Amino acid sequence: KKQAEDIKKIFEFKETLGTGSEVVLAEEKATGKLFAVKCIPKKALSIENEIAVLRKIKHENIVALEDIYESPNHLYLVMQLVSGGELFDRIVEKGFYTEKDASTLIRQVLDAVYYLHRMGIVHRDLKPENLLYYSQDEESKIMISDFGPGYVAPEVLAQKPYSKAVDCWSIGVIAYILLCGYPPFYDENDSKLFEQILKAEYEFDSPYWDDISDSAKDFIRNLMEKDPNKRYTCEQAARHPWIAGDTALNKNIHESVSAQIRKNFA
């Protein structure tokens, strides 16, 4: 279903879900089914060849590209709507949360980003906001919600040529936040803040990190590594014992993590 004279013949647009192109909550008039439609003005003029590739591939942990419509002046990417809820909301509400839970989340993100990297796509915008649950179910998978300061790799902030390794840094930062509930870099000045990011200066500070395993800390260090050449790839991280083995702990750390999430990501 490529061609439309007017997209409103197809969809009832309801709520804006994000702008940057715009993403709108939409209902297919013929079926009543809901989607997230990314509206892209044609003015932003390779792209059609790439969309044509991903339209045929469904990854368990990535929002699906379900359909594409073309109007006289716009391109519409009809995306799977993810209704399970936000990542942090779930953790705070759960009342019980362990390293195993964080590891399970990261494992899925690694799977998704590995696939994207294999397809030649660098995400460049990995953050907790882009991670959504498929369903309200207890066992719901997590999914990357969309794809094209504190989460950005040093080589990017340094205006250096960068690669897929920048996503791996972002995964490290997300893993850091999942284990303590606050970001690894923060300061009132942007001078030292950027400098701290540029120098990759972070700490597993007490008391927050006292009950976290050495294995988890090692895992994060391999991803939050200043040198993109030394930085773990997604493949390498997925082989780390914290992900692939049994070193993720089973201690309930919900109290501190949720308290920090509420404080820092209110």
Side-chain angles (χ1 to χ4, degrees), residues 2-4 6-7 9-14 16-21 23-42 44 48 50-93 95-156 158 160-187 189-190 193 196-198 200-225 227-229 231-266:
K2 289 283 304 179
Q3 304 302 315
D6 180 28
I7 193 63
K9 295 170 176 291
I10 314 294
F11 295 105
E12 177 182 3
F13 283 2
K14 297 189 172 303
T16 306
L17 295 171
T19 70
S21 68
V23 179
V24 181
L25 172 60
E27 174 184 346
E28 182 181 12
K29 288 182 172 175
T31 63
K33 300 183 293 184
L34 295 180
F35 297 93
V37 178
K38 174 175 293 180
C39 310
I40 311 171
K42 282 187 176 177
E48 331 171 310
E50 188 271 351
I51 292 299
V53 168
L54 295 185
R55 79 192 204 279
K56 287 189 165 191
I57 313 176
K58 306 281 180 287
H59 190 291
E60 199 166 294
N61 303 111
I62 304 182
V63 290
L65 173 53
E66 304 280 13
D67 220 337
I68 302 97
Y69 290 81
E70 176 176 18
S71 68
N73 292 310
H74 293 79
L75 183 69
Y76 302 93
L77 305 183
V78 182
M79 314 291 297
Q80 171 184 13
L81 182 67
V82 179
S83 78
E86 312 189 11
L87 179 56
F88 286 161
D89 287 13
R90 203 118 168 176
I91 300 182
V92 167
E93 92 194 10
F96 196 96
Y97 176 72
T98 75
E99 269 180 48
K100 277 188 264 123
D101 295 315
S103 176
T104 293
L105 289 168
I106 297 298
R107 183 181 69 240
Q108 295 172 74
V109 173
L110 284 171
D111 287 337
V113 178
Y114 171 84
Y115 158 72
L116 292 177
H117 285 181
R118 275 294 168 166
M119 300 302 292
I121 298 174
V122 182
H123 190 282
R124 274 154 205 181
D125 197 45
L126 291 174
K127 55 198 173 195
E129 294 81 356
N130 285 325
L131 299 175
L132 300 175
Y133 283 98
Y134 170 78
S135 70
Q136 54 272 45
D137 186 80
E138 170 68 23
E139 304 185 353
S140 176
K141 59 181 180 170
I142 197 84
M143 311 176 70
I144 297 186
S145 169
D146 191 21
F147 58 96
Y151 304 100
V152 168
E155 62 266 29
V156 177
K160 169 217 151 70
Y162 63 93
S163 65
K164 52 181 179 171
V166 307
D167 288 334
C168 299
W169 171 276
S170 298
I171 297 179
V173 176
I174 299 177
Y176 185 102
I177 298 171
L178 283 178
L179 292 182
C180 72
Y182 59 85
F185 311 103
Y186 179 76
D187 204 315
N189 68 24
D190 277 24
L193 175 56
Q196 281 159 333
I197 297 182
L198 278 150
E201 293 185 20
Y202 58 96
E203 288 305 348
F204 303 115
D205 49 310
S206 302
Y208 313 105
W209 288 84
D210 290 347
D211 295 320
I212 306 303
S213 69
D214 289 342
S215 187
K217 294 176 188 173
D218 177 78
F219 176 82
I220 293 171
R221 287 198 197 97
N222 299 138
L223 287 172
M224 290 185 62
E225 152 70 40
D227 178 18
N229 303 129
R231 186 177 309 152
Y232 267 12
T233 62
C234 287
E235 340 176 20
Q236 292 165 337
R239 301 190 196 110
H240 190 282
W242 193 71
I243 298 298
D246 62 343
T247 58
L249 300 184
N250 54 12
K251 186 171 192 303
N252 182 16
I253 52 168
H254 178 268
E255 184 175 30
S256 187
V257 174
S258 60
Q260 287 303 310
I261 289 177
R262 297 190 212 97
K263 173 178 175 178
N264 291 274
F265 300 93

